[PDB]
Design an enzyme around this catalytic site. Structure first.
Site, PDB file in Angstrom:
ATOM      1  N   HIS A   1       0.739  -1.256   0.000  1.00 30.36           N
ATOM      2  CA  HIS A   1       0.000   0.000   0.000  1.00 30.36           C
ATOM      3  C   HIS A   1       0.770   1.310   0.000  1.00 30.36           C
ATOM      4  O   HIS A   1       0.155   2.360  -0.123  1.00 30.36           O
ATOM      5  CB  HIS A   1      -1.073  -0.016   1.121  1.00 30.36           C
TER       6      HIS A   1
ATOM      7  N   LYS B   1      -3.588 -10.191  -7.927  1.00 29.44           N
ATOM      8  CA  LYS B   1      -4.365  -9.586  -6.860  1.00 29.44           C
ATOM      9  C   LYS B   1      -5.455  -8.697  -7.536  1.00 29.44           C
ATOM     10  O   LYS B   1      -5.136  -7.997  -8.479  1.00 29.44           O
ATOM     11  CB  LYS B   1      -3.521  -8.767  -5.915  1.00 29.44           C
TER      12      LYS B   1
ATOM     13  N   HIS C   1      -3.890  -3.042   7.692  1.00 29.83           N
ATOM     14  CA  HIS C   1      -4.857  -3.391   6.669  1.00 29.83           C
ATOM     15  C   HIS C   1      -5.367  -2.082   6.083  1.00 29.83           C
ATOM     16  O   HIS C   1      -5.511  -1.070   6.813  1.00 29.83           O
ATOM     17  CB  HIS C   1      -6.063  -4.222   7.181  1.00 29.83           C
ATOM     18  N   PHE C   2      -5.493  -2.046   4.752  1.00 27.12           N
ATOM     19  CA  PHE C   2      -6.132  -0.932   4.063  1.00 27.12           C
ATOM     20  C   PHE C   2      -7.593  -1.284   3.994  1.00 27.12           C
ATOM     21  O   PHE C   2      -7.952  -2.243   3.281  1.00 27.12           O
ATOM     22  CB  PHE C   2      -5.555  -0.699   2.651  1.00 27.12           C
ATOM     23  N   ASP C   3      -8.460  -0.568   4.733  1.00 26.17           N
ATOM     24  CA  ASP C   3      -9.887  -0.886   4.711  1.00 26.17           C
ATOM     25  C   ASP C   3     -10.652  -0.311   3.469  1.00 26.17           C
ATOM     26  O   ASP C   3     -11.442  -1.022   2.751  1.00 26.17           O
ATOM     27  CB  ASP C   3     -10.564  -0.507   6.055  1.00 26.17           C
TER      28      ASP C   3
HETATM   29 CL   LIG Z   1      -6.787  -2.245  -1.262  1.00 25.04          CL
END
Ligand SMILES: [Cl-]
Ligand SMILES: [Cl-]
Ligand SMILES: [Cl-]
Ligand SMILES: [Cl-]
Ligand SMILES: [Cl-]
Length: 124
Positions: A12, A41, A119-121
């Site tokens: 990210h 992904k 985590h990227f929410d």
């Molecule tokens: Cl993402």
């Protein structure tokens, strides 16, 4: 095994550009951050801010995660981001991504000591 914080950074963070640097940005970055090694992904966001700015969000506005967890934080300011999503013409091992640049608030899940993004929410 990769730590949670290290996986967040790999997947990210892109502090080396202010913004998505062409339509081929996602294809380039998804391969180089090794997100297309065994499988494409499907969806991934890159944040074009300093690592310190992104880490600071774990001290900003506490909000619910999509999953109902309570360890998510929304950035007080918008941030330059790029969303990468596979296109219909994507077929592993020739992955293909749409690049969408935007300036949005980010939402991240945080964890640990130091308390850092894992985590990227979402972005808003
Ligand atoms: Cl993402
Ligand atoms: Cl780490
Ligand atoms: Cl930087
Ligand atoms: Cl703002
Ligand atoms: Cl820890």
């Amino acid at each position: 095994k990769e730590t949670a914080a290290a996986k967040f950074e790999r997947q990210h963070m892109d502090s080396s550009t202010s913004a998505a640097s062409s339509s081929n940005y996602c294809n380039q970055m998804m391969k180089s951050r090794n997100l297309t090694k065994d499988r494409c992904k499907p969806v991934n966001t890159f944040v074009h801010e300093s690592l310190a700015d992104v880490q600071a969000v774990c001290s900003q506005k506490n909000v619910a995660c999509k999953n109902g967890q309570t360890n998510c934080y929304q950035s007080y300011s918008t941030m330059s981001i790029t969303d990468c999503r596979e296109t219909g013409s994507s077929k592993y091992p020739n992955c293909a991504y749409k690049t969408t640049q935007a300036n949005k608030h980010i939402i991240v899940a945080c964890e640990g000591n130091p308390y850092v993004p894992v985590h990227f929410d979402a972005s808003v």
